[PDB]
Structures are given as structure tokens and as C-alpha cells.
Structure 1
């Protein structure tokens, strides 16, 4: 039927949710960074929580990267047919859109980490 595509859109919403979870973790990382920097004697528990957040981000990102690569490989396999279709184009659009959102969140995270490392170094 249209099982392949209806299942594809469900996979799109899954990836979107993951990207949104990364975004949410990135904001919490920013909060922990501030708390650690504003504290006269930082709490080890807080540092541990920051570590788990970073770990969670890295893990969810690999899931996103992996699912997006899979979608792209599928698109290219289809293109090896030297032919196009409405579904192929729909999939190509969702892949570039999800990719854009993913790149934006990871870029924000990398900038947040670089900034924190700079402040920790410039410190004590």
C-alpha cells in the first residue's frame, strides 16, 4: 500500500523528537554551566549531572545521525534507478529539513561547550 511512506513520516516525527530532546539537554547544560561558574565551591554532584547530560546528548545525536544516514542511503539507492518520483522527493525534503534542524542544535551545543571551556580556563 503506502506502508513505506506512512512509516517514513512516523520515523520523521521520531527523529524530530530526538532533535528536540537534544535541544532541551543543551539548554540544561547551559544552566549547569552557569551554576558551576557562579558557585564559590562547585558541587561534585552537579558536575556528575553535567557529565550525564553530555553523555545523553552524544548518544541521542548518534541515533539521529544514524537514522538520517539510513534515510539518505535509501534515497540514493532509489536514485541509482536514474528515475524520480513524488515519494523520493518528499523523502529528500524531509531529510534536508531534519538535517538542518540537527545541524543547528549541534552547532549551538559546540558553541556552548567552547564558550564554557574558555571560561573554565580563563579561571581560578
Structure 2
């Protein structure tokens, strides 16, 4: 009762960390098409860019390490010689949380190189 009740309570705060990367990444996506190649935006359009790239790095490192602690805890209670429905419920929420985190974080890995590979 106590260990799975803390596991459901910590996911409701991490869904706030998942929405907080996809809103900050949607702002970088309006900035990076006028400025990667600046033919028209601002002077220091860069005046805000040291804020948005250092903001996604601080939350992304806070969330990515709570996602490894769920994958690290399944492989440590599997190897004990166990077969239970509480173990299998834990991989059901991890595969929905890591699939929505890869669609935005694997897209953000291509966003920093697409700023300066072409710089069109």
C-alpha cells in the first residue's frame, strides 16, 4: 500500500515537468526560423536566447534522472525472482511517460543542431 501510493503521487508532479518542456520547446520553435539565419528578426534576438536554452537544460536534467530511477528500480526488483501485477503496472506508466518525453526531447536534440548546421 505505502510504496505504490508514493509512486502514483510523484507521477502527477512529473506530468507538470512534461508540459513545462513542450511549452518552452514550442517558444524556441517560433524564435529559431527567423533567427538561425537572421535575414529580418531583432538585434539581440539573442537578449532572450541565453534564458530559453539554460531553462530547458535545468528542468530536462531534473526530470530525465526521475525517469532513470523508475527503469533502474524495475531491473533491481525483477532480478530478485518475482512475478507480480504491481511490477507490471510500473512499466505501463513508464512506457507512456518515456514515449511522450522522447517525442519532445529527441525533437529538442535536432533543434540545437538545426539552428547552426545550415544557419540557412
Q: Does TM, normalized by the shorter one, top 0.5?
A: yes
Unaligned runs of 5+ in 2: none
- Mark the CA change 1:5 to 1:29 in structure 2 (over 3 Å): closer, same or farther: same
What root-mean-square deviation, in Å, do the aligned CA atoms of Structure 1 and Structure 2 show? 2.2
Equivalent residues, number: 120
- In 2, Cα distance between equivalents of 1:46 and 1:13: 35
Structure with greater proportional helix content: 1
Deviates more, 1:45-54 or 1:76-85: 45-54
- Contact conserved, 2:21 with 2:59, CA < 8 A, in 1? yes
TM-score, scaled to structure 2: 0.83
Q: Deviations over 1:39-72 (max 9, x none)?
A: 6575455313222111111121112210011112
- In 1, Cα distance between equivalents of 2:53 and 2:36: 17
TM-score, scaled to structure 1: 0.81
- In 2, Cα distance between equivalents of 1:99 and 1:39: 35
| Structure-2 residue corresponding to 1:100 | 99
